[PDB]
Amino acid sequence: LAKTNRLAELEEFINGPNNAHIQQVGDRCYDEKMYDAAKLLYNNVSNFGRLASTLVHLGEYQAAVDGARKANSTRTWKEVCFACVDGKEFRLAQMCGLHIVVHADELEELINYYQDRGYFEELIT
């Protein structure tokens, strides 16, 4: 199914659980990115960084209110808002700012990702 098509690719992404090692679902889904089901399933499953990376348009403003909320291991971020400032001037990387930061000791990995791609202003603010 993961590799089915597009047509019934939104009819079963709602009724595909039946006990299994779905351990390949997320992986294959991550290998085969279509964002329209990485929630309708991820909200019945798990695997996140492998959510904020594979596909672009990001998961949109539809992956933050449920992303940095938990907080995970450093990295996948040195990518995200990094790749944001240069492209996507929606200012979607100021929300994701204090968002991904939420840390009691980081900010070192956070300075080769807000520079090389012409930052400042937004950074000094």
Place this chain on the structure above:
Amino acid sequence: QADRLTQEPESIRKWREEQRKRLQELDAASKVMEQEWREKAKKDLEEWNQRQ
């Protein structure tokens, strides 16, 4: 390179206009320091004059 020159040429001009933000002080220094210390030389000079 593939990302090394879009990096600075939209952030290098910081260094440019700051060198001209340099300027000033130095040149300002002596220009003004000139018209001043000399006014001082007359300060003492008129010292001489009256006092005598």
